[PDB]
């Protein structure tokens, strides 16, 4: 390989970062506890409004993938992942 993109920064000494900042405008929406919470629901929204076609199934697996720890969730989340990668 001889190509790459999308790496993060340290910005060593205290208080620094480019002045090309505001890249995010402000909107509003249901309050979520955390990020993983939002992504989870954002997929559920995507389900139902979609047919039992193919794209559906991915969402689905995606859903199990997002689930947080458990005897249940782990095993299935693990399958969901395995499946998804093997989906390529």
């Amino acid at each position: 390989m001889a190509e790459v993109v999308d790496l993060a920064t340290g910005e060593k000494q205290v208080l620094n970062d480019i002045r090309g900042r505001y890249e995010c405008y402000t909107d509003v929406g249901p309050s979520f506890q955390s990020m993983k919470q939002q992504n989870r629901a954002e997929i559920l929204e995507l389900l139902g409004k979609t047919p039992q076609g193919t794209p559906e199934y991915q969402l689905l697996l995606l859903q199990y993938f997002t689930l947080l720890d458990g005897k249940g969730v782990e095993m299935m989340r693990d399958y969901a992942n395995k499946q998804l990668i093997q989906m390529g």
């Binding site: 506890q33 993983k36 947080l68 720890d69 969730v73 989340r77």
Partner: protein, 48 residues
């Protein structure tokens, strides 16, 4: 005192109502992991 003192006592019934409602909606804690934390971070915690 000497005069009669009695109890129509309307309020309990609504009290009992509300309680009766909150009792069947337990509501506990959850402890989700975190945006960066590995999935099985809470189970330990919650486990206890």
């Amino acid at each position: 005192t000497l005069q009669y003192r009695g109890q129509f006592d309307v309020v309990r019934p609504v009290v009992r109502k509300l309680v009766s409602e909150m009792r069947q909606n337990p509501i506990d804690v959850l402890y989700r992991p975190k945006d960066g934390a590995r999935p099985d971070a809470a189970d330990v915690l919650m486990g206890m």
